[model samples]
Structure formats: C-alpha cells, structure tokens
Target chain A: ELDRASVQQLMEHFLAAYNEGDPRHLDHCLHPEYRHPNPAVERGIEGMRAAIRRWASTVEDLSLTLDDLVVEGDKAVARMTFSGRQVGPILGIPASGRRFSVGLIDIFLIEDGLFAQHWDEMDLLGLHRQLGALP
Target chain B: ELDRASVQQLMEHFLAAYNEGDPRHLDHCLHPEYRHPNPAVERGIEGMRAAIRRWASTVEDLSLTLDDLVVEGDKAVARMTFSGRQVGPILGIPASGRRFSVGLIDIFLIEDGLFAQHWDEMDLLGLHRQLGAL
Candidate 1:
C-alpha cells in the first residue's frame, strides 16, 4: 500500500499546509496518533496545528522549501530551507524585523500513507545570529 | 557504477573514518577535490582532517553513530548521533567535563564512489546547552 510516489504525494500535501499556514490540510496527511518527539512541540495532530499557528503568528511570509527528499523503506528525510522575517517575539527575543534563512532537516516515519512520527534538526545558532538575537 | 549497495558501503567507510578519528581512512573515501561548505571548517580534504583532529582534541571518547541512511542517485543523506565528553575548550568556552549527545544530518554528494561535496545540519544549540557552553 505504501510506495515512493504515495509518500512524495503525502509530503506535498503536508508541505502545502505548512506553506499556506492552514492546519486543516494536515488533517488527512497526519496520522491520528502522530508523535513529535521534540519537547518544545506538543504531541499528536493538534500539536502540529499549534506549532503551525505559532509560526504563522511569529513570522511574516514564512516558507519551508524542500531542497531534497530521500525516501527509503518507511522513512523520508527531507532537507529544506526555512526562511521568513520575524515580526513577533520568539525564544524570549523581541522582534527585530530581521529575515533569516537556515537549513533544516526533517525525518518522517510514514505509516499507512500518513506521517506517523517526526524528528528534525536545524541551524538554530545560525538562525539566532542572523536575527541578531545572539552574537 | 553507482548503486544502492555501493553507496551504503561507501557511507560505512566514511563513518568508520569519523568514528575512529583517523583521517587516513578518509583518503579513499573522499574525492581529491572534496568541498565542505561550512565556513567554520576548512575547504578541502585537509580541512576534514583538521576538523577531525580538532574534535579529537576537544572531546574524549567521541563517537558518531549512524542512525539512518538514505541514498538516491548521486546523493546520500545520513542521520547520525554525535556523542562525546568535552575535555578541552571549544566555541570560546572552557570545558565543563560534561558529556553531550546531539543529532546530526549530513548530505553528501558522491562522485565515482568518493564524497565530493558535503553539507550538514546539527542541533548546535542543544549540544552547547548540554555542554554548559550556552
């Protein structure tokens, strides 16, 4: 039931929801029991929605562009660029109206054609420095 | 010449060199003109050697464990865990004798079975915080 094409399609829909800042589109792409291990992010589908909402509120013109996607077995690793201009406070730092572009890598565990679990790493230091939040 | 099996084998070799802290093992795994885009790191093969040496000096019992590997065409994306205990200064902070483990993702462009160019992302903030540097 799971294949490369289907996985890619699911990612397309997932990314669409993120880019559009609409969590409704994620309803069908995320599993009911979706899990995000990051302590900063809540667990399950609602947590994803909350994260999207928070980012949409904190940044203007936020975009996560896929640079490369590698699918093997039931895992998909996506290399992407996260770019946006900060317009609201984040990480205890006041907005400086600075724009930042940083590399992000996300790994999705696909189950029954839906994103079941997720983990990610990003250039947080570079992002903070770019935003003038840190030297 | 490029196949999934060969790519996996190449990655094994690449990781082995890193885990062992032996740059000599990289001689056959890295292309003659290998490029690492990170400005903090030097450019060519020697740059990689220098980085390995730096880490080896700063961290004791340093290890890089491969968690995932995905290869398609000429590119390979590797997810790994970097673990070590700091014993020397790093990033302008003195050692706290603390151990840290963090996730790392590396994308490698392979040419003729050797790594040609590389890009990577890591949980630097988490690493620094765990090491009491941040």
Candidate 2:
C-alpha cells in the first residue's frame, strides 16, 4: 500500500545510515529478515551491522551516493556508487590503505509498508581490482 | 499444470506461425489482444497479420532458429536467430535485395492454457547493419 514518497524516504534512510556511520540506525531501515550475500557475513540485522562495522571502522572516510531511482509496479531499484579508503582488516588482508570505488544496484520488493525481500548486484570484481585484492 | 509437453508445443506453434507463413495459427496462441510495439502495427490480430504479411511476402530464402530457453516460475523466454533475403519494400525502401540476420528474445506470460501476454526484446541495430540499411 506504500506509495512513491514513503518508499523514497525509506531509501533515503538507508543511504543516511550508510553514510553517517551510526551503524545502529540500520535496524530502523533494514528488515529483520533481510538477506545480503556479502561473502564475509551471513543473514540477519546483527550480521549486517557487524559486516558494516568491520568495513566502516577501517575504511577511514567512507561515502556512498545513491544514483537513479526507477520504480515499476511494487518494486524499486537504485544504482549507487561507494568510495572509501581501506584502513582496516578485511577477509584476512590488513589495511592496504588504498582507495576503492564500486557500483551497486539494490532491488527491493515492497509490501505492507515494509520491504519483503532484497537482492543486490554489486561490482565486486571491479572493487577487487581497485584494492589490489585481485592481481 | 503444463508440465513440459504442452509448454514445448505452445512454443513450437509460436515459431511455426512465424516461420511457415501460417499467420492464421497466431490466433490460437497470442491473446486476443496482443500488444506488439512494431512501428507499423498496433494492438490486436489484424494489425499483427498485416505486419507479418508485409515482411513475409517480400523476404526470400528465410530461415529462423531458436537458441537457448530458460523457464522460471510460470514464464518462458526464448532466444532466436533469424536470417532472410530482402526482396521487397520495407519502410518505404524498394527492393534493395539484401541479406539480413538478427537475434530476438521473446518473453511470455502464460495463464491457464493460453498465453496471457507477450513481450519481445530484439537486436535492432545489428539487423539494420546486416541489411545495409543503417
């Protein structure tokens, strides 16, 4: 039953949480049942926070910008660009201190004022190349 | 309920209608009100037939083949390759007698025993290039 305005606000809340580093703001937006396929984490909001905390605590100056918004039927998709400095340990590598930028598309299916499911397509290979994670 | 046999037949009828100049078979498959986005045609059956007749009458040595197919939930998508020789007027071009080959992917939404709707994605640029029209 949610319209475009409410959905847009929810999207803004998500972007704000990612940018502010107030990792607690996560639960307000992320569904308790969210499933993100980040290799370093499993499922649930705690796993989400821990994954973000690990990256945010080390990425020095992390910033994310949401790109275009396309809404059709009951689904909304957003393309975003994330850039940050590697200042911590991740997947066993210690602070390469390199800058990395990657693109992500977040797709959400909305129902009854909440996101029922989400699937993310990220530029993982591009980030790995940028951070020298891949030779 | 269409298991695989019925689904495969529906897909074959679709391709046969396109290939054998039997546009009549189209009525059995395409919803009574199919929406095709061809510039020369619009909604419904006559519009579809006219669009087909114009191309089929002029094209010579035509061959079309289906490629990969993927089915998810209740939908099936087919990728196809089509090649033909142009021997008549198209978009007001009078018989350049050229050869053309193109790729197309068709998406279908089936309900009960008939197709509820259909949509198509095609490689228009490469076809025009092959026809030497672009």
Candidate 3:
C-alpha cells in the first residue's frame, strides 16, 4: 500500500504526462500490468502511450487541471477539467477548431507506487456540444 | 475533519437517499448551506431534496450502486452507477420506457459529519442515447 504523499506525487507525474503531451512521462508511473478498461485501447503501458499520442494528435494546447484529489490507502480519485482545442478528427467528428473544456473524474489503483488500474467518467456530451458536433 | 469511518457512514446514508428514492434520508446528512453547482437546481439542503424528489418522479426502480469509495481527510469520492427506467418525461423528451445505466462520479466535502459541497461528473450523453432521445 502506498502512503498518501507517495500517491499524490505519482498523481502529479501522471498529470504531467497529459499536460506536457509527452507519453514518456508515464514510463515510470505506470505498472507493467496497468489495465485501462477502454476496449479500443490496448492493455498495459504501451496502450497508455498510444492513447496519449492520440489525444496529442487530436487536441492542441491540451491541458488537464486537477480540481480535486482524494486518496485512501492505495486508491486515488482525481476530479479534473480537460481543456483543449480540437485540430484533428476525434471519434468520427471532424475538428471544429473550437475550444472545449469538460469535467473528468478518474479513479486509480496504485501498486508499488505505479498506477495499476484506471477508470474514469467524462462529460462527453458536453464536450461534443462545445465542439459543435451535436446540438 | 471527520474520520474515515465517520465519512463512510455518511456516504452510506447519502447513497441510501438515492437508492431508496427518499430525500428524507439526506435530512441529517447535508449541511444547511450545502452547495450543488448544478444551476438548474436551487442551492442548499432543500435544493438537494427537490433534486432527489425530481429524480424519483421521473424514474422508477432508480438504483445507485457504489462501485468504489475513496476518502481522505474531510473529502470523499464515490464512483457509482445509476440505473433506472424512465417513466416520466425528462429534458423535454417524452419517456420511451427505456432503461439507462450511466456512470457517475461524485466528490463530497464533509463538514461536521454533513455533506457541505458536492460536485459530480455524469455520462449524460450515454443516458440520453439509452433513452432513445438522441
């Protein structure tokens, strides 16, 4: 089980990976057996890198702001706002060059100071509406 | 700051409010100044009651399953699944008798064992689609 401070530090690194748009920032932060339930993404660290790369390719000036964080034992939940401008197609919706900011909540299970399992809920409808993809 | 056990108990009471379709369960769990950012809802404890009552009116068999709960200091986050059937009109869409199960993540700030401020993210798009309204 990881201490609160240790988990907080790891969360910082994890956020840095998104804010910097650099997947390498996740190399030391993800467990080898990391599991992301998103079926489209591959499993493990490589899958995470691919997911980050996809985000970087679609969104410019990507920013993830940590609004709230709660940690207990080896688990942590982060409430964040993801903001960026769409420059490339995402999920079959063409880029509208519109800036979108949406709420995202992520839960992580840490193992040996690395992120082991990740689950999240995001405001996808709000995002699509902001991007002018939906009415 | 409330202890972890205390916070957990409060969370149980809070979830019971939703699971049982009874806003009275929140009578002792929410502070008088409770803040919910949803602009459509009024502010404070009575606002929460109105919101819950609205949900009860629109949906039947409303069930909230606490999938995960994490607490630190006076803050807690609960990852939950909200499942129910639409029986009344919602968001200007006539009820289609569809069932929807959506993800909901809620963060609560506790004060003296009562929920003070609450924020949440929910899969509303998925819910609309499931209801065949989109």
Candidate 4:
C-alpha cells in the first residue's frame, strides 16, 4: 500500500513541523524507536518532540527549507537548510543576535503508512561555531 | 596532507589484488578497530585476508575492473564490477562454470598515505541468482 504519494505527504508534514517549530504534528511520522550515534543523544518520538520544542524556541524567524529531496523504495532523503536568528539563549551568546544557515540531511524509512525509522546528519559543529560557542 | 597519487595507487592495488585474489597486499591499509553489522564477521587484516582467500579460490578468471572512482578529502569511493567464471568449489553451484558480474561499492578512509578503514556494499542476492546458486 506504499507509494510515492505516501512519501510526498511525509515530506510536506516534516517540513511543516520543522518550519513552524510545532512538534505536535509529527506524531506518526517520528518513530518511537530511534538511535543516534556520534555525540550521543538517544531519543524516541516523545523525546525528539521535547528536544525540538526546546531548540525551536530560541531561533527567531526560523525556517527549514528543503533544497532537494529524493524518495525511493520506502526511503526518503532530504537536503534542507535551517535558517534563523541567534537571539535566543540556546547557544548562550547572550543575544549576540546573529543569523546563520545550517545544512543537514534527513533520512526516513517509511513503513506501513508511517516512518518506521529515521536517521539524520546535521552540521552541528559548524552551527556551534556560528553561535560563537567556539573560537 | 593528502595527494591524488596516493589515491590512484590504492585504486590500482585494490583492483589488482582483488582480481588476483591475493589478499596479502592489504596489510597496512586496514584498521584494527573495525566493526561490521548485519550477518557480521568482525576481523582485522589477517581475518579479512583469510576470508578473501577462501572466497577467491572458488571463482576462476576473476577480474575486477574499476567501473568508476571518485575521491575527495581523504575519502575515496570506488564502484567496481566483478566478473568471474564459476568453477571449482565455492558456491556449490558446482562447476557450472558460469560467468557473472556483480556490482560493489567500496568506501575508503585513506589516511597517513594508506587506507585506514573501509566500508563496502555489495549486491549478494543478485549475484547468487546470476550464479544459479539461488
């Protein structure tokens, strides 16, 4: 019962959630069983939503735009750009109030009308440097 | 600290060793702390050499050609096509002596002038069907 339309809807919902910073809409699409390696933040769907809620509050004029997307065989990958102002306390710049863009890739393993698993690669180190966390 | 010459040498040696089925040339390029998941077989240089040696003696006229190769920033990825005559005692396809081509991609983390680690993806199910093993 899976097809391209399934992936198209998934993409639309994913970007909408990211851009609006509303974690409520990602219930079915975010898998409960997810593991992230490298820098070690382990979270399921609920945990992921909580993290997103905390992170999204700090970015002003936040937007996540999908630059390119590819979907094949129940798998979808998207190259996205995250743009926002750093006027928030997340990076602890004390409102240096700079804006930056970060590039990231999101991968989804869609199964049975929902995302069964997810993996992501984001340029976090570069983001921290941009936030003046490192010199 | 990286050069194109080093990458070219790796490509040459890799294909040559693979075609000849001589895994001995793969001494320094492999890493000690390597991990593989999914029907896992975990070993460093010596274990890998054993696996390759056992595998190679089965296929006759084995030749590996670098169909395409790309290298960037101490990382190199190569797409290879393996052609062989199914002879001797490997897949138990039994001297069908059939010929087959398998596609594989090898990603190498080249460092200190040699391949420090490698991750490989190979089409196994398709190869079996082609070799009449499935």
Candidate 5:
C-alpha cells in the first residue's frame, strides 16, 4: 500500500535524478510503461529519454527546481521552474547565448512505485520571447 | 473532515460562478476571508472581485474551463483554460480585438467547504504574445 511519506521520498528521488541529468537514475525511477501524452514527445520511457536528450542538446546548465510538490493517493503533482542558457538552435530559433527561465506544472500517476503516466503544461511563449521569436 | 467529493464539488461550483461572471455566485463559493496571493490582483476577496471586473472590462466573451482537478486532505489544485477576445487595453497594450487563450494551474486550501487561500501560475507570456506585447 502507498503512503504519503514513501511517495514523497520517491518524488524527491525522482527530481534529484532529473536535476542531476543522469539517464540511468531517471530510468531507474521511471515505470517501464511510462507515458507522457503531449505533442512534443512521442510516448513511453524511450520517448522520455529522447526528450531529456533533446533538452540537453539545446541548452547548457539546464536545471529544474520544484516550486511545490504535492502527493495524494497514487497521484503526484509539481509546479516547477526550468532555467538554462541556450547554446544551440531549437524550434527554428537560433541561439544567441541567452539564459531563459519558465514555469511548468507536471502531473503523474504513480503505479508500482514508479511514474506510470505524465502530463504537463509549459510556458512556450516564454521560450519564444527568450529565443527572440517575439521581440 | 475533508472529502474529495465535496472539495471537487466546491471547485466545480467556483469555476461555474467565475465562468458565469456572476460575483454573487462567486461570493457564495468563496470563504469570507478568501485570499489569492498573485501579482495580477491585490489580496483578499475584494481584490479577487476587482480582478474579475478588470478581466471583464478588457476581455469580451471571457470563459474559463476546468481541465483537471485533484483533491488531497484540505488542498485542491486545478488546471484551467481561459479564452476570450481582447476588446480593450491591458498592461498599456492597446487591444487589437484578437482572440486569446491561455493555461493556468491554481491551488487552493479549503476551509469550511469554501476556497480560503489560493495560489496559481498562469501562462502570462502566452497571453502577452497573443495580445501583441511580444
């Protein structure tokens, strides 16, 4: 049975792995059937790994910090901040070596002590502004 | 004691009041001492009322839709969508009568079955972009 303490611990470990940018650690914490249903990424754990790699390729010193994290039953939600300096082109925007920060909210359903499904919303317009798409 | 059903019900009612643009209905759902700590508004229920009025003033056919809501203990969070046409100036930007939509995630603490304290994150950058600020 899942408890709040254990869930919180897992969530902490998950964020730590993500912040550390360690693919192995992230894989260890993720469910084998993990899915993040969104337009950018495909599906499953492999898709998640692809996203991590894509982000790593685009930005330098990328970091994600949790503003707040809440767990209830088998669900966990987080308000997060993503910040980094752009070094490579992304979404047709050429990098000018500017750092950017934006807010995100992520929701996950935990099953078998791992993230089974993920859904999130992000500040795409902020990215555009930082990338000079909107000036 | 806090139950998920009651909390979700109250949340739905709160959104309904907001979408209807009825301050009386909104007051019925808010705690007497309700507070939402956000930059777009002042503080307390009166501030929320003012913010609502402000939005109504600037946006035509404004509507809010609840996307997701979860309850745990005395806290509940909601993902919502706001959409409308800008018909008046906002933040010094002259309205171009453009239609705009944005996402927002709001967290609230419930007391006595009403929203007591609220915190939220909104895609203001998107709103600004839509309003031709960016």
Candidate 6:
C-alpha cells in the first residue's frame, strides 16, 4: 500500500502530465492497466491519452488547475478547473472560437501504487450553454 | 467546534432536508445566509429553495441518494446520486420525459450549528448527454 505522501506525489504526477499536454510525460505515473470511467475512452492509459488529444486538439492553451486535493488511505479526490479557448470542432460542433471554463471532480482509487480505477464528473450543461447547444 | 456525533447528525439532517423535497424540511439545518457556490442560485436559503423548486417541478420522483459522507472539523462532504425523470421543460428544452441519473458532490461548512456555506459539483455533462443535449 502506498503512503499518503506517495499518493499525493502520484496525484501531482498525474496532474503534471495533463498540464504538460504530452502523453509521454505520463508514462511513468500511469499504469498500463489504468481504467478511466469516461464512457468515450477505452480501457488503457493510451486510450485515455487518445481521448485527451482529441478534445485538446480543438482547444488551445488548455489549463487544468487543481482546486482541491483530498487524500485518505487508498483513495484521493481532485477538484479541478478546465479552462481553454475552443478554436476547432468538438463532438462534431464546428469551432465557435469561444472560451469556456468548467469545473470537474475526479475520484481516483489507488492500488499497487498506481491509479486502479477512476470516476469523474464535469459541468457539461454549463459548457453546452456556453456553446449555445442548449437554448 | 462540535463533536463527531453532532456533525454527523447535522449531515443527516441536511440530507433528510434535500431528500424530503420540502423547503420547510431544511428550515433548521440551513442558515438564513447560506451561500451555495452554484452560479445558478442566489445567496440565501430561500433563493436556493426557489431554484430547487423550479427544477424539481419539471422532474418526477427527483431523488438524491447519499453514497458517502465524510466529516472533518466544521466541514462535511457528501457524494450523492441524483436521479429522476424529466416531465417538463428544463432550461427551455422541451420535455423529453427522459430518465437521467448523475453524480454529485457537495461540500458544506457549518457555522452556528447550521450549514453556512456550500460548494457543489454535478455531472451536468452526463445528464445532458443522456438527455441528448450534448
């Protein structure tokens, strides 16, 4: 079992990988068997990376900042703010060139010193409202 | 500074209020100046009640189930599932009568024996995606 310090460091490593916008940076921190709860993404770390690339491709200067990090025993929770400017298509919607900011919460379950399972929630209603998809 | 028992009771009271779907049920547990971090709601218990009523009006069997609760000092956190069937309009979208379920997390800060401040996160994207909005 990983200690609290190591778990915290692992969380930082995961965050840094996303912020760095490079999958190679995530190589060491992510396990080959990582499971993401996102239904659109496949089951491996590479799958998650591919999904991120697809979404990030349409956005520029994307930054995800940790708002809160809570660690206890074998689990951790992260609250993050994802902000960026959309300059291309997303989910088949043409580029609006608009900026959007959304809040996301992710729960990570750790095992064997790696992220074993994950759960995430994001403000998609707010995002669609900003995108004029819901009127 | 309250004991764990008192804080746990407070959390249950808060959950019961929301579960009961009656603003009056929240009377004693919610501070008059309760601040919800959700931008859609105003800065008071009454305002929150109004907003809830508006959304709840359009949905049938609106229920919030507490999956987990953790309390530390004066802060309490709840992980919940909110599920219901949309029977009417929501944000100007016509009633699809679709059933949807989403995850939600709420953080509450207690002051003077009542919930004085709150922070929330909900899976609105999942909710909308289910409703075919996104």
For all candidates, state DockQ relative to the true structure.
0.75, 0.03, 0.91, 0.03, 0.43, 0.50
Per-prediction TM-score: 0.91, 0.48, 0.96, 0.46, 0.81, 0.80
Candidate number achieving the greatest lDDT relative to the actual structure: 3
Most accurate candidate by TM-score: 3
Candidates 1 and 6 compared: the better one by lDDT is 1
Query: What is candidate 2's lDDT per residue for A9-34, written digit by digit as tens?
Result: 87887777778877666666677766
RMSD of 5: 3.1
Q: What residue pairs clash in candidate 6, if any at all? A: A124-B125
Quote model 2's TM-score for chain B: 0.83
Model 3 bad stretches (over 4 Å): none
The residue ranges of model 1 lying beyond 4 angstroms of the native Cα positions read B39-41
lDDT of each residue in A24-124, candidate 1, tens digit only: 87887898778879667677788889878888899998998888888878788888898989998877768989998999888888887789997788999
Q: Write the per-residue lDDT of candidate 3 for residues B35-78, one digit (tens) a residue.
A: 88877678889899887888889999999888988888878888
Clashes of 6: 1
TM-score of 1: 0.91
Model 3, residue A107: C-alpha shift (Å): 0.4
Model 3 gets an lDDT of 0.86
**In angstroms, how far off is A121's CA in candidate 4?**
21
Fraction of true inter-chain Cα contacts (below 8 Å) kept per model? 0.78, 0.00, 0.95, 0.00, 0.28, 0.53
A16-56 per-residue lDDT for model 6 (tens digits): 76677777655655677888766677887887678567666
- Candidate 4 lDDT (Cα, 0 to 1): 0.66
- Clash pairs, candidate 1, are none
Docking level of model 2: incorrect
lDDT of 5: 0.77
